[PDB]
Amino acid sequence: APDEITTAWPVNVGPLNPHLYTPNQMFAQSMVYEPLVKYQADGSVIPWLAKSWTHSEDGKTWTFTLRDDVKFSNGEPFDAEAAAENFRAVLDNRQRHAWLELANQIVDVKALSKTELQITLKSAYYPFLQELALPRPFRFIAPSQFKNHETMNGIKAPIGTGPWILQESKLNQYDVFVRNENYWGEKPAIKKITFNVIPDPTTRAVAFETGDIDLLYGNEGLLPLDTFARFSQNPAYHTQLSQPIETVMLALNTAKAPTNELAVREALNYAVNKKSLIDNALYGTQQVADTLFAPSVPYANLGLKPSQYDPQKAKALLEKAGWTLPAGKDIREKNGQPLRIELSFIGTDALSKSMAEIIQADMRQIGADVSLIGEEESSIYARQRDGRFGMIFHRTWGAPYDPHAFLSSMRVPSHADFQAQQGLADKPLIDKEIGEVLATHDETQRQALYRDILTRLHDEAVYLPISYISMMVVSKPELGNIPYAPIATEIPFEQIKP
Ligand SMILES: COc1cccc(CN(CCN(CC(=O)O)Cc2ccccc2SC)CC(=O)O)c1O
Numbered sequence: 001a002p003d004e005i006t007t008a009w010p011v012n013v014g015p016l017n018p019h020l021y022t023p024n025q026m027f028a029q030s031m032v033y034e035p036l037v038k039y040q041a042d043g044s045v046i047p048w049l050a051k052s053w054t055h056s057e058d059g060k061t062w063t064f065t066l067r068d069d070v071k072f073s074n075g076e077p078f079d080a081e082a083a084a085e086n087f088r089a090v091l092d093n094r095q096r097h098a099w100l101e102l103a104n105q106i107v108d109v110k111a112l113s114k115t116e117l118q119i120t121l122k123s124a125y126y127p128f129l130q131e132l133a134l135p136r137p138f139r140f141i142a143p144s145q146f147k148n149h150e151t152m153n154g155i156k157a158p159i160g161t162g163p164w165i166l167q168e169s170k171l172n173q174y175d176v177f178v179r180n181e182n183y184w185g186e187k188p189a190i191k192k193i194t195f196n197v198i199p200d201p202t203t204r205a206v207a208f209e210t211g212d213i214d215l216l217y218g219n220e221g222l223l224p225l226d227t228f229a230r231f232s233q234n235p236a237y238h239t240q241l242s243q244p245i246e247t248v249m250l251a252l253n254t255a256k257a258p259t260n261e262l263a264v265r266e267a268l269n270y271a272v273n274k275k276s277l278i279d280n281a282l283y284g285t286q287q288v289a290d291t292l293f294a295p296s297v298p299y300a301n302l303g304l305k306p307s308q309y310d311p312q313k314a315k316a317l318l319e320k321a322g323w324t325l326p327a328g329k330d331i332r333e334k335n336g337q338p339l340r341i342e343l344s345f346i347g348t349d350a351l352s353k354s355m356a357e358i359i360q361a362d363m364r365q366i367g368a369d370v371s372l373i374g375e376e377e378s379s380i381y382a383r384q385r386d387g388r389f390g391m392i393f394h395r396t397w398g399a400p401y402d403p404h405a406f407l408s409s410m411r412v413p414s415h416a417d418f419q420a421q422q423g424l425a426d427k428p429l430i431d432k433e434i435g436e437v438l439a440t441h442d443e444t445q446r447q448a449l450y451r452d453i454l455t456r457l458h459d460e461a462v463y464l465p466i467s468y469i470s471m472m473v474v475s476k477p478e479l480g481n482i483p484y485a486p487i488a489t490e491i492p493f494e495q496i497k498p
């Protein structure tokens with residue numbers, strides 16, 4: 001067993017290098033490795049591996065007082081030296097962390113003693129503590145497990161301070177975690193967690209029905225949503241649906257014809273019946289999104305005007321811009337050119353395909369010819385990084401990334417958002433203001449800058465917001481209520497109490 005559970009994940013957890021990305025899975029890195037400060041649902045951080053901290057008047061020098069009772073799972077001590085060596089290991093690979101502005105802000109990290117850790121920054125970077133709280137990269141592996149005094153070229157054993165220890169991994173089969181019996185904090189009620197590798201959502205549903213697994217936990221792609229709805233009525237099962245955690249949208253390429261035209265992007269934003277899309281493809285399980293960030297997101301309650309479903313207005317906008325229908329044709333033309341837009345998505349993702357088909361149908365109704373380009377994952381991500389798309393499915397990152405970290409990353413040219421925004425005359429101003437907002441401690445100016453950035457992105461119709469999506473749970477009733485974590489990408493296994 002009653003203190004052992006079996007769940008599933010589409011892939012293995014990876015080698016659990018705390019400082020690297022794909023194929024490491026963030027929820028699993030968070031099971032084993034811990035931060036200096038821990039993120040809370042109210043947006044603050046609490047003391048964690050660091051007991052307390054102070055900062056200089058200019059806000060550029062921070063000194064953390066560390067706990068002195070923490071051991072890595074292999075018995076070796078956690079101290080300021082171990083922490084400092086981890087920061088070094090991360091920043092020796094600084095280029096790979098460009099998306100995260102703290103990695104560009106840290107100028108020095110040194111252990112002043114066994115318990116005092118000093119971090120110095122380029123500027124007064126306000127999201128400092130929240131980015132220290134992220135699943136990666138600033139969490140701590142035992143320095144003995146460095147390879148050649150680094151982590152960027154690999155690690156030995158994935159030894160953390162966290163409440164879970166990786167027991168064993170079997171590529172394409174399973175991963176097994178066990179409770180850390182020597183954890184500095186509270187002991188998890190669960191003793192053992194087995195992750196079965198099950199890449200297909202239908203197969204995951206079937207695995208639950210047969211009793212092969214005890215728990216499914218994930219976002220809107222966890223299992224088929226019609227099946228989820230059926231499960232929620234099944235008295236043998238338990239299901240949960242969280243409050244929304246992030247946005248799913250479309251990103252429109254402002255630097256590529258015909259989405260380079262504001263009038264076209266505005267029309268597309270009137271063309272989609274989002275409520276119908278959600279009820280049709282998402283089985284009514286998610287919420288309609290009118291803006292890049294939901295009004296509940298910090299700094300994003302701005303009274304931005306929604307573009308409600310209005311095919312008539314969409315047509316009028318296109319007509320006014322010179323996109324008119326030839327005799328006998330349903331696809332508009334201008335200057336000889338047809339109104340043709342390519343929508344790229346992961347071809348094997350049934351949900352994405354379903355939504356893409358609905359979007360194509362809705363846009364054909366207003367005279368736009370959307371071509372569906374379904375491709376493998378690697379090809380879609382390549383398209384995102386180099387801007388080879390007309391429209392592309394995209395999503396925000398949830399707490400604590402939204403909005404500051406998502407906005408920060410809009411400045412990175414190898415990200416979808418930069419590419420989508422590249423055609424805007426105001427793009428340099430936007431990027432300047434993003435840099436400014438991260439470093440201001442004038443709260444009035446900070447809100448003003450967020451308003452200007454988000455309002456320009458909204459008014460320029462860079463995105464086509466679709467849904468605010470939720471976390472979803474399917475479980476054996478004996479496991480009880482399943483909690484959600486403050487960080488959207490983490491799974492609070494240590495909080496489960498049968
Ligand atoms: C569930 O995945 C995410 C949930 C919340 C935020 C992000 C954004 N990631 C941003 C950085 N990634 C790129 C991206 O998701 O666009 C990973 C990354 C960083 C540096 C170089 C490569 C890559 S992916 C090969 C954070 C992370 O992966 O730690 C997520 O990828």
Ligand SMILES: [Fe+3]
Pocket residue numbers: none
């Ligand atoms: Fe990522």
